[PDB]
Design an enzyme around this catalytic site. Sequence first.
Site, PDB file in Angstrom:
ATOM      1  N   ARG A  83      -3.068   9.270  -5.522  1.00 23.55           N
ATOM      2  CA  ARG A  83      -2.556  10.394  -4.687  1.00 23.55           C
ATOM      3  C   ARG A  83      -3.719  11.345  -4.371  1.00 23.55           C
ATOM      4  NH1 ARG A  83       1.818  12.556  -2.273  1.00 23.55           N
ATOM      5  NH2 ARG A  83       1.850  14.843  -2.282  1.00 23.55           N
ATOM      6  N   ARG A  85      -1.541   0.917  -5.865  1.00 20.83           N
ATOM      7  CA  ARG A  85      -2.504   1.572  -6.796  1.00 20.83           C
ATOM      8  C   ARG A  85      -3.897   0.979  -6.605  1.00 20.83           C
ATOM      9  NH1 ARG A  85      -1.116   0.290 -12.581  1.00 20.83           N
ATOM     10  NH2 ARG A  85      -2.177  -1.626 -11.922  1.00 20.83           N
ATOM     11  N   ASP A  88      -7.570  -0.660 -11.270  1.00 21.31           N
ATOM     12  CA  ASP A  88      -7.086  -1.025 -12.631  1.00 21.31           C
ATOM     13  C   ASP A  88      -8.178  -0.643 -13.641  1.00 21.31           C
ATOM     14  OD1 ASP A  88      -4.891  -2.177 -11.186  1.00 21.31           O
ATOM     15  OD2 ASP A  88      -5.683  -4.256 -11.407  1.00 21.31           O
TER      16      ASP A  88
END
Length: 423
Positions: A83, A85, A88
């Site tokens: 903000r 995905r 990782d």
Amino acid sequence: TFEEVVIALGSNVGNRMNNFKEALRLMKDYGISVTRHSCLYETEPVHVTDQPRFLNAAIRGVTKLKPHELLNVLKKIEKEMGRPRPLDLDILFYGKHKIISDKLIIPHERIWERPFVLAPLVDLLGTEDIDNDKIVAYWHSLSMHSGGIFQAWERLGGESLLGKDGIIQRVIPIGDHLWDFSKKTYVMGILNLTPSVDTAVSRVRSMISEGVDIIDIGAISSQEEIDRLIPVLKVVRGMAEMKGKLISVDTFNSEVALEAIRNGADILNDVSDENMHKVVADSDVPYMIMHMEICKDVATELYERVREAELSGIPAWRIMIDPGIGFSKGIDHNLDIVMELPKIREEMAKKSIGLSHAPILIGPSRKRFLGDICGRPEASERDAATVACVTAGILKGANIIRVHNVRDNVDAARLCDAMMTKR
């Protein structure tokens, strides 16, 4: 106080390298001190997908944070960058023993069958250096089938996995592209500025038609050097013929470095100023370092300087090596560097396997030693000797050759590359 950790990085989302750059900053701020970065890996997908390829890496550092505390900083970085995905982060190793929790298997059994985890993991470890690397013996013993991490890699295919018909490739990031400096021999042509702007461009235009890959522009006083380099840097960079070609620049003056990076220098070649590490850190430019019992001396000398550079925020994945042929005042040492390049890599591997895989540039071109050996007191008469020397060095593993005579050395590179093709 401080527990040693290893964290894996993975991304196939957005500017994959920006995610790794960002993760490394947020790791610092949130109480993770990174001591060693792996090489960068670009992994092929093992199933049909329209998704981008993954960039895979690993880091090694010290942290106060406890396992669950650490995991939560990683989960935090993951959401905070988010903000799908982008990045990782996974804990591969924490301290000396296996951890189990609800979801925290450290080290997970999956890591011994994932080349994109194991290859970068291996790079963080020395093969000897047991004296100064106490924690590694434990990590080795956490391997599922014994023989250490090194034999787990070997079981998967080891280095055989990287190269022609490879699952995965060692890559160096240069701005927005990834370069595989192992896939062929790259030829860097010398453009010297003290033997003007219009001659420089026609020299370059000639190097480009001769097959060159990289233009080395090298020019002492901090402003004199800016005044000579930056104008031709600007012109050469704008040339239509120079699209998808790299420019290295040869300086020891941080202020020349900064100005050169800003004006389109792709690779920064230092030869040795504590300001320099800072310039190269803010930038996204590969950092080539030159060297100042010969194999061992060169390896360790180089290692010490790469450890320094990693600690000051310069990952090993954009660090390149020149063992510094033809600065040694004598024949025997220069011949050794060329003929014992694999041995220098073993010696590097003992402190850092990652550094053992770093791309190696050799610059034998018309150096005195070729003169003394072949009876060529005129530098310009030393080209046949240079082709021979450059052919030896490529056969002994060199990835980049710094040359005066572009065409003749390109013919040698193209032939070496055909000869070393496994068939």
